[PDB]
Amino acid sequence: AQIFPRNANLLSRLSIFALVLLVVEGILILGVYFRSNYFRQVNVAIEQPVAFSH
Amino acid sequence: MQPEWSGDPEVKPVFLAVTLTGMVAFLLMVWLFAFYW
C-alpha cells in the first residue's frame, strides 16, 4: 500500500495470467496461420485464364 | 508450514481455474496440432 494501490494484487495476478494466455494465444495464432486455408490455398477456386469447367 | 492462501475462500475456485485453463489451452493445442489438417 506504500507504493501500489489496493487492486495491485488483482492487476498483478491478472497480468501474470494474461501473459500466460497471450503466449498460448500467440502459439495458437502461429499454428492456425501455418495450417490456414489461406496459407496453403485450400478450398480456394484459383482462377484460370480461360475458366475451364471440369 | 502452510501457504498463506491455504485458509482463503479463493483457493478453491482459483485452483479449479488453473485446471480449467489447462484443459482449455492444452486441448486447444491438441485440436490445432493434431486434429486440424
Binding site: 494465444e25 495458437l28 492456425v32 490456414s36 489461406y38 | 482459483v14 482449455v24 485440436w31 486440424y36
Partner: peptide, 25 residues
C-alpha cells in the same frame, strides 16, 4: 479473482475459436 479467471479464459476461448474458424475461413 476467480470469476476474472473464468471471464478472461472465456474471452480467450471465444477469440481463439474465432481464430480456429478463421483458419478454415
Amino acid at each position: 479473482l476467480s470469476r476474472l479467471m473464468i471471464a478472461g479464459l472465456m474471452v480467450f476461448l471465444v477469440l481463439s475459436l474465432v481464430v480456429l474458424l478463421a483458419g478454415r475461413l
